[PDB]
Amino acid sequence: GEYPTVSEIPVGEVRLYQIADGVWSHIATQSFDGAVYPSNGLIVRDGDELLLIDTAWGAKNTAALLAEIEKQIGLPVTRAVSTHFHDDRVGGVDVLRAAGVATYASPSTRRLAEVEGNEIPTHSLEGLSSSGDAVRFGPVELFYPGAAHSTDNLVVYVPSASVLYGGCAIHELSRTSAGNVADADLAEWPTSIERIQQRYPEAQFVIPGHGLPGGLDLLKHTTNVVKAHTNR
Ligand SMILES: [Cl-]
Ligand SMILES: [Cl-]
Numbered sequence: 001g002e003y004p005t006v007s008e009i010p011v012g013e014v015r016l017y018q019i020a021d022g023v024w025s026h027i028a029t030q031s032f033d034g035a036v037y038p039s040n041g042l043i044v045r046d047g048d049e050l051l052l053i054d055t056a057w058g059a060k061n062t063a064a065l066l067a068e069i070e071k072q073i074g075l076p077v078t079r080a081v082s083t084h085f086h087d088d089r090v091g092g093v094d095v096l097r098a099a100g101v102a103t104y105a106s107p108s109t110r111r112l113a114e115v116e117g118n119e120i121p122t123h124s125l126e127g128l129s130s131s132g133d134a135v136r137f138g139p140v141e142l143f144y145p146g147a148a149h150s151t152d153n154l155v156v157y158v159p160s161a162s163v164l165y166g167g168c169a170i171h172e173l174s175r176t177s178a179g180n181v182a183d184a185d186l187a188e189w190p191t192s193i194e195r196i197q198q199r200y201p202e203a204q205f206v207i208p209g210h211g212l213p214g215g216l217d218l219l220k221h222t223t224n225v226v227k228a229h230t231n232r
């Protein structure tokens, strides 16, 4: 199927895209600094339940995400993981919590969300504090590749489907800039990408934080973009 773009997704709405069996992305149109763009998260079937990766940025959008999941899939979301502390990825956690979803993040993410004044996932994910750390979490592996887009950023791999979701640590091909780098670690980002390459060389589908999916070429693209920004 054609991957949904901002022209299929009005502001405040959410669409799902089935990447593979029991794996979807969720896509929401967001507004920022004069522009609009499509933000991805992930949904992974976990027996007869669903694991959500990342909110849809804010209470209203995350409610709309839960509705679209019920419409298109119809299984209960029982757990959610936020991949870093920024408002776009934890904004909407209170809605998930109120709807009975167990919300998770690393202690690193929880700490930085609190400092920032953002919503804070309730449960803490142990075993991810050091670069290269990985932990199993139901139908996914969570991986802390090192600092990149942020110091806490996690990536998520679905072994059954060979899908890698990079959140904002991986850029789509149409991105030329490094994105919001206020909290990034530019010096460590290319090393962190190399850890991802080394761990998941078998990945077939790579989902960037924003925009169009691709393959492992997205990792090299991301390092190219990051180098360009470093050498500005
Ligand atoms: Cl730990
Ligand atoms: Cl588990």
Ligand SMILES: [Zn+2]
Pocket: 084, 086, 149, 150, 168, 180
């Ligand atoms: Zn961010």
Ligand SMILES: [Zn+2]
Pocket: 173, 220, 221, 222, 224
């Ligand atoms: Zn490129």
